[PDB]
Subunit: 431 residues, 4 copies
């Protein structure tokens, strides 16, 4: 950590790393992150899981880990004594099953603690003592319980000691009787009590998938929630997650987020803007209008001045046409279309880096290219957004100063004429 | 850890300290020590007790600690709760006074862990989940259990990371129920489980007390147990600690000793032969004989050679008188008396380094001066044994090469006679 | 050290980074690198220079650094000293101005050592005692020396301690006399002695410049040396650096490369294929042929298979057209152009990982596009070479599975035809 | 070191270690200690030397070590080139001899550095660059030099880094010429420039010897110098040390000291009052008077009160006889004799702990036993001074509360009467 005092200047993307670090170091205690890792992960990828969690804990951060026991107990060691795996409301365990669950959750818990230590970091075994539960479901569900309180003494002790606290889903009733707590109801209680700035689900998949097969980078629940639930291509398992994640995020401050990655990406996910998994925030709504009057042109001047680093030319704003503008509620990202020969033309796309990390730039760019299937725009040849534009474009012409892109399905010869006019437009920002 | 291999060879004793460091660095995990510590010490001397256990840790050792709830739940947190301290069997807990118990011992437990971390050491909170217990008492005692099995899972994980396992006296049952376990029976089944090299009692009292209020340095149960049980000065409570202490040591190897101290004296107690408290071993028998033919002169000569670093002069043995010889069953410590102008004289006091530390040098010495109230003996002025002789003498005369000691108050005018005769005597050893 | 093996495998590239780590950890001692850093660099950017070298140290590498004293002694401490900057042979120092040099470079030396230590890294001041030198100039220059022997005493011990050996350009003679050594001959004699895997030049300029002022990424002396010296755009001073760079590389193994950078890009330059500066290797020869029979279709069949991860389809080679083939002497990098409607088309561009990193892919590509100013080609949409193709193309069209590029500014209406033929084309590779 | 935040409470002598630690930690820079170790030590005992030095440097301390190369150069690598080892004034080195001394002191320097680092600590090789010397002794002495200036640039760097700086006796003239510096003249030169709190000589023997063969613990130059020089049992070699040592301390503040131990003793030496070798201070003069008026009875009451923790009984002073009083100039240690049945009797012996650490208690006690060959005194049986008394006694009788000692050659029958009177003296102090 002292040997990471100025080990913050050189990695393959080194400057926004600093800022993500100096933000998770707003510790309070263990209010940094509640990381839920499934039973499947500790079995099929324990080293990678460990290195990833242990990496954090050397750079100062101390997550609170909750692990399940899916494959471990719900199979490998509870089909063994031919007990068989009945699943009622969401999980039944008769009194006979209890001592096996006890011994196999504790075994995974310690398996992980040691893995973290052996990987360079520090962990703290907390199988029990956190979850105080009620039992009301006796003949209904058996010995499964619902959290009434969270003792955070053991967890706090761990943070002060610089140790990732490792929780196992074992609970205790008021009068000390043991109980099996389901891993989801457990995470919820903990996220509630701790109010973490970050909730991470480490899965083997590495994030929710979109209609095309790709990983869904950002989800902005304010605009995207309805669209997803309603969709035909979203399978039952994705909707329960989203509905759950949203239930979690509605119980946290706006600054809290959820990430869904695989252990290997976890650092990429937490320490760069672009991320490396699925980010899900409550997010913010957007205005789609063609009435320039309504927009706060001052805040836009600011947005452009910050995003591009240079200001818009004198009297660019009141002289501007506007075919449609898309601006996020906070004026931290915006897309502004004009018209060029009757073609929709993207005149400004401005997104502050911190807005880019929350997925707002994509929230804006998607509503924009949804209105404009056939889109033409340009970008300086040095612009770092060029890689993003090129993944989104369908064609491009490249000169020594500007590069014109286009979207839609038009044979190159069709857009050859509008392209030349875009190269000959005056600069709307100096330098 | 590694930054410790030197700290020590320069100490006030730094020669036999090397000896103890290696002896104790036969880890086998947590088989180094079991350290019972009453509730009274954690309350009244948390900082020093924490520094003690920290010290052990920095030097590379990892003890298993067990704390009780004397001046805590059996006072403080149930004297202002109106349950009234129920004492029947030896420690009764109703169901009502059970969730009181859980959190009283749990608070103590973390206080200890942080205090140890505060003082520079590594420790690990293991509040519950070790003692698997049978609830045999029903209504007569309440919610008290007796360890049928010991889950050393959590203990092991601590050790590997080099941590002191701070256990609490809370237990499970076959079917979950949180149950109270009294400290001593906990320590018994735990010592039986771990087979530690060293059982340590930390009390404020600082040791065990002898007839005249001094600290009883050592007890050798082979020879001393019967004596200590039938002496009237030994109070009924000391006749209890001793019996129970016997039960533990009868369940350990002969190499395993029990020590009783206070936190500030623990290091001196562990890392010196001299000790600093009350060592109690199973030890070994001793013969007291006047017939020389009934001894093993071969083993004695080995002993003399090994102990003094020089061998006995020619024919010393065939020529040796022998008023009374006191040799311990293993010939690792022996005292042999002759006669001198009628007075009893000590010709040989031979103890091997290791034997001195098991209190065998003392055992033999104590039996000899019980036979020889009036005793004369001598010692080269560089015998490091001089300090102990001095502490045992009633007088001394000093010349350059030898020093004559005597003992048993006998009017220093008639001792001028026997002192001179003692200086005159031919050597019986060379160099 | 141990707390480092993971930091990186999660990076934006974290896969080719493992390789160079493995490569740079063929220790021997200080044979990883020799890093010359000019005087102007320690004065104007001391912190950045130190974070760069500190980073290396944390990663487990220990470069041998050699610093000069441009804007220090050859200015600062002798422009208000009246000795007047004598420059004749190439670096003159009289007898009087020798103790000025001594305390100037050493001050510089410790400014560097402490700065490195401040940024978290380990370093060792070696102001003198490495360079045993011959006073070859007499009265013509004064007290300037030529390295006869390199004493690696201090350097080896630095390395062993995980330290950057910070050498200064001061040397002895056979009989003691302290003598001045100019930085370049020092680096030459040092590289010859150390035979490092890597020679690195740190300047503020950040690399070497091409015809149009951009940074020249790679130089392959085999093909490029003659071309560059007879180039009129390569200035007389740049023609000197290259000459000396050859001389260093001709005395090193073929695996020993040279980099020229600025401190901020040092990590990227060393741990990625793409680099971030100017690489210079001895490299290898390249054939350019239009005759298919002058090629080894077996060896190309391997190259292609290894580059794409898939094998060329059956009979592809016997059937292959071939306008021009560009294959490097070791068959690790090749481009094969065919014909398509009169246009030159690139059927295969195959570069192996190591070859990409030695700048051989660049070598082939550049020789290919100098023969084919007007070029058409395609690439699957998930080819990571796409980014590079994009930086080189003048246009591109994108469908789901493939993407067509073209090159050489030629009015996007006449290329609409040959693009279709390119998408139409049957694959020549499978999976 | 953080793991020595509270690792300062338990060792075989735990309370005065802290105080020495918090005193050497007044560093300024490298002003703590200049440690001279002869060539003989690095040859015949390098591991022990290193651990001894590595311990300092891990507890915060940064000594500056100067080593010679006695056995190394005066043999190991310089009888080899048949040069013969001539010693004029005190050391001659012809021009031919220079390059061997260089390579063999340097080889010794790194041998020491690597040894320390392998032993846990941190060091900084400074074979050359510290001693700037003059040569005026050309054909007389050859290439030997006497320090004219001390560059501490390298030494301060080592201190800041927490590195024991390891200096070799190699010098440099104004014009860079190499030179052989004698190890004694260098230490003289270095102590002058650094003004250390401590000057330590690490030798194989382990401290100066007294007339009896034992190690001489204290020398109080104000009182002991003249007495030693003059003595018959002090050989010429002991005289040259004493002359040199005095020459050093006379160039340091009164607070400086010299210790002469062996590496194995060095910690005991610096961190306890008793030490473990020979300590030498400029010290302070003494009053031996029989006029009670002249003594400052105010300052004496304070002394007794501090040294004993209890005050002298009401009217002990004005009723007190005083046969002779021995008081150190600062009233920090004192011996007061009265008369008892015509025998000299030591009524008070009082020494503040810190004065016992500067050797004043022994200075006071030495003039005392010189005045009183036949001395009787007493001391409580629990007094830690008893072991010192017993080493100094000629006889002693012991009861359960007090113990009477005596000096001189008197058969028990001669002192049996007075001893009884010493047992019956009133306590002249309360509690
Ligand atoms: N899938 C993503 N785009 N994630 C972006 C993550 C942004 C930010 N570093 C965070 O951890 O919250
Ligand atoms: N009370 C005593 N004198 N104990 C001696 C202790 C010797 C050794 N350190 C041990 O723990 O067994
Ligand atoms: N200027 C460049 N393209 N350099 C490439 C660097 C490749 C490799 N990492 C090396 O250091 O040799
Ligand atoms: N030979 C002695 N008695 N030395 C005493 C040393 C006292 C003190 N610890 C010091 O280092 O200065």
């Amino acid at each position: 950590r002292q040997t990471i005092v100025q080990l913050l200047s050189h990695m393959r993307d080194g400057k926004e790393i600093r800022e993500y670090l100096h933000r998770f170091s707003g510790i309070d205690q263990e209010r940094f992150a509640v990381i839920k890792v499934g039973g499947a992960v500790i079995q099929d990828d324990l080293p990678g899981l460990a290195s990833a969690l242990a990496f954090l804990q050397t750079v100062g951060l101390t997550p609170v880990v909750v692990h399940g026991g899916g494959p471990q107990l719900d199979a490998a060691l509870e089909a063994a004594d031919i007990p068989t795996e009945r699943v009622d409301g969401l999980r039944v365990t008769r009194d006979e099953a209890m001592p096996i669950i006890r011994d196999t959750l504790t075994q995974a818990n310690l398996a992980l603690v040691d893995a973290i230590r052996d990987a360079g970091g520090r962990a703290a075994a907390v199988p029990r003592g956190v979850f105080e539960a009620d039992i009301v479901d006796a003949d209904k569900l058996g010995r499964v319980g619902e959290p009434r309180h969270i003792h955070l003494d053991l967890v706090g002790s761990a943070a002060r000691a610089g140790q990732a606290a490792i929780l196992a889903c074992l609970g205790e009733t008021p009068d000390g009787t043991l109980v099996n707590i389901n891993a989801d109801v457990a995470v919820r209680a903990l996220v509630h009590a701790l109010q973490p700035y970050k909730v991470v689900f480490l899965t083997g998949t590495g994030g929710l998938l979109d209609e095309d097969g790709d990983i869904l980078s950002s989800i902005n629940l304010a605009t995207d929630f309805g669209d997803l639930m309603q969709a035909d291509w979203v399978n039952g398992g994705m909707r329960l997650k989203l509905e759950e994640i949203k239930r979690l995020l509605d119980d946290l401050p706006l600054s809290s987020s959820v990430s869904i990655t695989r252990p290997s990406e976890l650092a990429r996910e937490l320490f760069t803007h672009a991320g490396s998994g699925t980010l899900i925030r409550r997010g913010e709504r957007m205005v789609a209008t063609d009435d320039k009057s309504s927009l706060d042109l001052g805040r836009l001047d600011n947005l452009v001045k910050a995003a591009f680093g240079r200001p818009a030319v004198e009297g660019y704003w009141d002289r501007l046409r506007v075919d449609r503008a898309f601006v996020t509620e906070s004026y931290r990202a915006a897309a502004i279309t004009t018209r060029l020969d009757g073609w929709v033309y993207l005149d400004k796309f401005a997104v502050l880096d911190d807005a880019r990390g929350e997925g707002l730039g994509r929230t804006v760019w998607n509503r924009m290219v949804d209105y404009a299937p056939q889109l033409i725009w340009r970008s300086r040849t040095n612009n770092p957004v060029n890689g993003f534009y090129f993944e989104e474009c369908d064609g491009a012409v490249r000169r020594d100063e500007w590069t014109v892109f286009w979207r839609g399905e038009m044979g190159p010869v069709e857009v050859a004429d509008v392209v030349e006019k875009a190269f000959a437009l005056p600069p709307t920002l100096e330098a």
